Design a protein around this ligand. Structure first.
Ligand SMILES: *[C@@H]1O[C@H](CO)[C@@H](O[C@@H]2O[C@H](CO)[C@@H](O[C@@H]3O[C@H](CO)[C@@H](O)[C@H](O)[C@@H]3O)[C@H](O)[C@H]2NC(C)=O)[C@H](O)[C@H]1NC(C)=O
Ligand SMILES: *[C@@H]1O[C@H](CO)[C@@H](O[C@@H]2O[C@H](CO)[C@@H](O[C@@H]3O[C@H](CO)[C@@H](O)[C@H](O)[C@@H]3O)[C@H](O)[C@H]2NC(C)=O)[C@H](O)[C@H]1NC(C)=O
Ligand SMILES: *[C@@H]1O[C@H](CO)[C@@H](O[C@@H]2O[C@H](CO)[C@@H](O[C@@H]3O[C@H](CO)[C@@H](O)[C@H](O)[C@@H]3O)[C@H](O)[C@H]2NC(C)=O)[C@H](O)[C@H]1NC(C)=O
Ligand SMILES: CN(C)[C@H]1CCN([S@@](=O)(F)=Nc2ccc(C(=O)N3CCO[C@@H](c4ccccc4)C3)c(Cl)c2)C1
Ligand SMILES: CN(C)[C@H]1CCN([S@@](=O)(F)=Nc2ccc(C(=O)N3CCO[C@@H](c4ccccc4)C3)c(Cl)c2)C1
Ligand SMILES: CN(C)[C@H]1CCN([S@@](=O)(F)=Nc2ccc(C(=O)N3CCO[C@@H](c4ccccc4)C3)c(Cl)c2)C1
Ligand SMILES: *[C@@H]1O[C@H](CO)[C@@H](O)[C@H](O)[C@H]1NC(C)=O
Ligand SMILES: *[C@@H]1O[C@H](CO)[C@@H](O)[C@H](O)[C@H]1NC(C)=O
Ligand SMILES: *[C@@H]1O[C@H](CO)[C@@H](O)[C@H](O)[C@H]1NC(C)=O
Lengths: 321, 171, 321, 171, 171, 321
């Protein structure tokens, strides 16, 4: 009569690594590294993203006419830019503090596009019909949908002065532009004054702009330049615009709501009727594993990104059948 | 292994024992069979499940983390942001790979220990009523029926009950 | 006759956690996590902090009259701001590079407040008595204690020019302001010149300021603005002020000493007659433990802050009585 | 445990042994008592005190570390400062909790090893002059007075001195 | 050590054994000599070489990393760059020193285990044909020539071949 | 007859540390910490560094005449500055975005110094011979080698206008300066216009400069100032300079090639005929070890810097002979 002590074995071919030995075949093991995604853009915690399509952030905010107009009010969980966004700024110039504005938008969860200065009520003594071939639409010259190119009316450019009081209960993002003609002949033609200035003031913003006229290399067939500026108008505060030339006046502003966990990503994936807790630019992740090796950019509740190819913990024994 | 049982004096495992990680094989006049030691297997399962949960719980969930944009005059700041992102990725990749390697080594040693301790428990019970024939097997010096085998498996082996008969056959 | 092998047990109820098992009762253990503080602001290594009281950094440096005046010379180990510092800048405007100045003060251990431009000796041809209701004191209009509002005298504002040579052997922090009236009528009344300018130059500082006049929303009942500027005057260097208007001249400057291990914290705790090696905004820590979970902001020689609730290392055995 | 002594074949601890972590209990005609093994206890104390000091020494003192202020146009820099502060806090919290868990497991296994080694030292001395009665106890086959007990405790047990008497009673 | 062999019941090492980490010393009528156990030594060498390579492979190469310059109005950014550089240096110094300490402890315990397992392999072979004389040595109850010694070293000791002679001298 | 189990011992005196015990003597061990360097500046992966000698980055780029002129084309693996670089900017002023330019140069592997505006062809109606005692050479007044001080010719300073088209296929670094005289008498003498301006424009750069005249403390015996500016001219783009005074025109520009793994270091070590894969400011490292404690600044494939004094892993046993 005999009795023996032994241990389990099976047909498992799973391998793990140790400090002393590699390629150890084990009876049971657990994978800790998520490497699978669905390859689609999904809703995040029940909220769909804001897809800018052909526009980048700059094109959407200024209202580039080559992009499909969005609904007046949108709420989202993250913002998607396409890698080949051809539609951005169409009239050449500098977007001042553009990257800071992008960082601000990373914590915004909703916007309302509203008319801050109505087109046919705010500038009775100025021409508002200015368009350019740089911002074309359907083969015709056009302009930004959210801005208005003010020029002289009947040979005169009266000193304008307009203000808006923020009664939305949320921050209001106001954008405007300053035009710099390439020569003094055009400056007098458009604005009738050579020593023109633009003033924009709020309770915490105070800046004065002056045109700087010179011949410049052609960018998008324009020797002129347009500089773009923005500010966040606090609830209950007033913004005042004063100018006697070169002002690219605001027409539409954005009332912004603040949220958590949002961000901006670049992806060529397509939106699908799916829901996820974790979204990467390559696709969505459905996993409870602690690590992933899919992409370092993540939105939502996600596993930690690591460079590893394999992370397997043995639970069973060395397998010796 | 560290304790010398698995891949040591017990050369190979049992594909015929599917109900547990450690157990017994017996052979007497009533037949043969495999019987897993439920106490040690369940205790090991609780410990291992503890270890995997601890590894997962120690890694917090990664909430939203996207990149930033910098203009042509912010190269230093851009490189500082890259240095931070690369440095954290270096450390977490380092911590994750090493933790798995270290715990994998301990897990195999943990299983080796359980087999050895289980072997010593039987050996300390049988004493000189049986002989070590190697490969982790004991040959009894007396008849050991299914009830006798069950007494060894659950730690209630009656050594005096068989001492006289064992001594006679031990000659 | 028998002899037995055994191990210690006692009445200890201390528990520790392991990777394989939690709530293990052990005979002996050591706590590594400091979770106790005294709830008071103490002296740090024998030096008391600088408490700004009702002022913030901006109010103290400009000399807001609503705060209690400090002694001419102070030496400290850290700076305390109250969470509800109502007294800061009283005349609305921009404090240029304010956060950089705060970072500079984080490594300062001493100041000497001295008269850089004496009130009754430096500006014989200008009025120096300007006060505003924004910087009130005891219900009366007043002004910053360290600055002087220069205005016209007898209908004229002569072009001023004053300089100071740093003979203190330490860096001298000089602060000044630029006033921007809301309309040209006030600009001519106060300073008599419309195209006024202010120039401030040292060996390594060179800036020119020009007023920018426009109507602005009322902040603290003032449509005007005052912009505040500063520079660190190196030992042995000269600073020259030149202006024909709008200059808020310096009157008191600060000779600064550099130190190590200091910082600025916000706390509502009270100063006590105690000494510590480690100070947090919640209180002082007296401990040799390697970790603490009290506050991430620390001054002095402190344990490392972690998010953990418990960090206990077993020294004894599993306790089985 | 890994070595099977604590909470294993030695079921429970001794509240009556207050002078050490490991030791002996004896019973003969002269009486009974507990005697701690000073050599193993002191060696373990030195090792454990070493371990705690190493953990504390490996963590440098945290010198002054306060926050920074940023204006409304420095959000990217503010978020970079937050990412650095949060990331370092994540790693140090991770390192601290795991180090304690890992060393706690080793410390309990260290104590288990000392008991087992102490048990094997006595067993290798007594040989067949005594019998293993379980629970870590040995029953002598000969009279063993206080001097005889002291010889076992300090490793100078005279096996030939009692071989004849033990063999007779071993029968 | 954890397994009680090195600096334990085997007090000291052998300067006369230069061909391996673990081995045997024998003494019979044909002479004496040291013989290293090539199987265990080579297996340990492979494991240890594995461990050192894993430590080196886990540390990536440090590519170019130089400082940055900041003007007098970028003190916050300069201090943020210093905080990042100091913080990463703190962690890597921490990780490096602790990894060496932890692996050094395991390496010594690994060698202790190999000696103990090697000792138990011989003890399980000789059974009662020899006696444990301490210090890790066995005294045979029968004549054991060079061929007999080689059988013990390579695990093919013929116990029944010498049982009768051993029992006679065991008396 | 006897057989014994034993383990190896030898004459080794190597010691290692463990968590439980220190000063453990072991039979075999491996050092993991590199602490040796050769104390020389070597070629890195077969490419020699660019040593600036007496110049710093600013002095080399502007062409300070006190440094030895370099060859027209250089290719390097890293840049070395001496700790006591006395030759930098010689005419006092501000180098705008100097630190950003240094960061750009950290990824540059080659330059070609070429004449962007030839001295005797580009400015026929202006004087180009201006020199200063601040930028002396061999005891005589001189000027930057890469720049040209334009002044009035025959009592007149015509409005200049010059452009360059980048046909190099690489980025072209253009540097220029703006002079600020200390009084209006000198401004009229040198440039004949008081309301002078300088304009520099490319497709993505657009800046206008205006002199700011005031008396200033003497720096290098000069009460005037010169501000230095730069831009990277993209391949195929045009830069236009327009000024009627105060322009310190570019004469030589740099066509730059981009590389990987380069950087700028400060070192007083000497160049030697050696090759290395790892270079520190103290010397070169030849090692496969994972850690080093020589210097935190490294160029190339280097071990990781740590603060530790000893990192030794035991491979053998405890040594007990
Ligand atoms: C990693 O670990 C795995 C787990 O065992 C190893 O896989 C096994 O490797 C052998 C040899 O390469 C495979 O082939 C076998 O070779 C013999 C020799 O001719 C042949 O007769 C057998 O029929 C068999 O094909 C074996 O299939 C394979 N087992 C698997 C993949 O499940 C592997 O070698 C280890 N090393 C590496 C570098 O992957
Ligand atoms: C964590 O570890 C501690 C250490 O033992 C555990 O504490 C003990 O838990 C028991 C059960 O909850 C407590 O109550 C006891 O229950 C029996 C059942 O009725 C009762 O008759 C006894 O009189 C006793 O009250 C026991 O007092 C408690 N010991 C302490 C606190 O020192 C604890 O359960 C473990 N688990 C958790 C989640 O904390
Ligand atoms: C660190 O570990 C080393 C390795 O053993 C220790 O080195 C040894 O220490 C002893 C005592 O300090 C040295 O001197 C010896 O002392 C006796 C007493 O008089 C003397 O008679 C002997 O001739 C011998 O000189 C011994 O030479 C030394 N061995 C070396 C350096 O190889 C050391 O003590 C440990 N501790 C420290 C803090 O370093
Ligand atoms: C996020 N996920 C992935 C995590 C969340 C935490 N868990 S968990 O900790 F439960 N993981 C495992 C996974 C596998 C095991 C394991 O080896 N066996 C389960 C118990 O019967 C064992 C057995 C089977 C046949 C014969 C003998 C023994 C096999 C264990 Cl013990 C734990 C997974
Ligand atoms: C910053 N502080 C907190 C640190 C600084 C470093 N030390 S220290 O390393 F010494 N800590 C300890 C704390 C406790 C112990 C321990 O279990 N006992 C002390 C020695 O008799 C043991 C005993 C008592 C009765 C019966 C049997 C044994 C109990 C040890 Cl061994 C080390 C504390
Ligand atoms: C970047 N360098 C530094 C690395 C790259 C990886 N290696 S490596 O892993 F191979 N290092 C070592 C270094 C030393 C050893 C070792 O103790 N002995 C080598 C094998 O005979 C052992 C022996 C000698 C005489 C008697 C008995 C046994 C001694 C080992 Cl096992 C590994 C070094
Ligand atoms: C152990 O098995 C025997 C069968 O021989 C049985 O009589 C006894 O009750 C069992 N004890 C336990 C605790 O299960
Ligand atoms: C051990 O104890 C015995 C008492 O039986 C005593 O004679 C002997 O000297 C002791 N040896 C040591 C080393 O303490
Ligand atoms: C072991 O050694 C014996 C010598 O006694 C020899 O006959 C036998 O072949 C050896 N076996 C192996 C596997 O080397």
């Amino acid at each position: 009569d005999t009795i023996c002590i032994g241990y389990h074995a099976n047909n498992s071919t799973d391998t793990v690594d140790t400090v002393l030995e590699k390629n150890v075949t084990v009876t049971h093991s657990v994978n800790l590294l998520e490497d699978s995604h669905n390859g689609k853009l999904c809703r995040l915690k029940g909220i769909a993203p804001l897809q800018l399509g052909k526009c980048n952030i700059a094109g959407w905010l200024l209202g580039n006419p080559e992009c499909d107009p969005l609904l007046p009010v949108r709420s989202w969980s993250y913002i998607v830019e396409t890698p080949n966004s051809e539609n951005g700024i169409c009239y050449p110039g500098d977007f001042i503090d553009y990257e800071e504005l992008r960082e601000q938008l990373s914590s915004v969860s909703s916007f309302e596009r509203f008319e801050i200065f109505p087109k046919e009520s705010s500038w009775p003594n100025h021409n508002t019909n200015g368009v350019t071939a740089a911002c074309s639409h359907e083969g015709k010259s056009s302009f930004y949908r959210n801005l208005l190119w003010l020029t002289e009316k009947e040979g005169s450019y009266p000193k304008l002065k307009n203000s808006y009081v923020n009664k939305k209960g949320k921050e209001v993002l106001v954008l405007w532009g300053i035009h710099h003609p390439p020569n003094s002949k055009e400056q007098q033609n458009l604005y009738q004054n050579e020593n023109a200035y633009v003033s924009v003031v709020t309770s915490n913003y105070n800046r004065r702009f002056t045109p700087e006229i010179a011949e410049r290399p052609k960018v998008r067939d324009q020797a002129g330049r347009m500089n773009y500026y923005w500010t966040l108008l606090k609830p209950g505060d007033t913004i005042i615009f004063e100018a006697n030339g070169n002002l690219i006046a605001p027409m539409y502003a954005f009332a912004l709501s603040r949220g958590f966990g949002s961000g901006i990503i670049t992806s060529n994936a397509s939106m699908h009727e799916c829901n996820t807790k974790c979204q990467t630019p390559l696709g969505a992740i459905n996993s409870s594993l602690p690590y992933q090796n899919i992409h370092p950019v993540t939105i939502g509740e996600c596993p930690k990104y690591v460079r590893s190819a394999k992370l397997r913990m043995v639970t069973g024994l060395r397998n010796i059948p | 292994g560290l304790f010398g049982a698995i891949a040591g004096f017990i050369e190979g495992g049992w594909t015929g024992m599917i109900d547990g990680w450690y157990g017994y094989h017996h052979q007497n006049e009533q037949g043969s069979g495999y019987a897993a030691d439920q106490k040690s297997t369940q205790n090991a399962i609780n410990g291992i499940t503890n270890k995997v949960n601890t590894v997962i719980e120690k890694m917090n969930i990664q909430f939203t983390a996207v990149g930033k944009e910098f203009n042509k005059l912010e190269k230093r700041m851009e490189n500082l942001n890259k240095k931070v992102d690369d440095g954290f990725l270096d450390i977490w990749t380092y911590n994750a790979e090493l933790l798995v390697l270290l715990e994998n080594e301990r897990t195999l040693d943990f299983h080796d220990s359980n087999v050895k301790n289980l072997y010593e428990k039987v050996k300390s019970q049988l004493k000189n009523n049986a002989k070590e024939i190697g490969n982790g097997c004991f040959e009894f010096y007396h008849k050991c029926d299914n009830e006798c085998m069950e007494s060894v498996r659950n730690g209630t082996y009656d050594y005096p009950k068989y001492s006289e008969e064992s001594k006679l056959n031990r000659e």
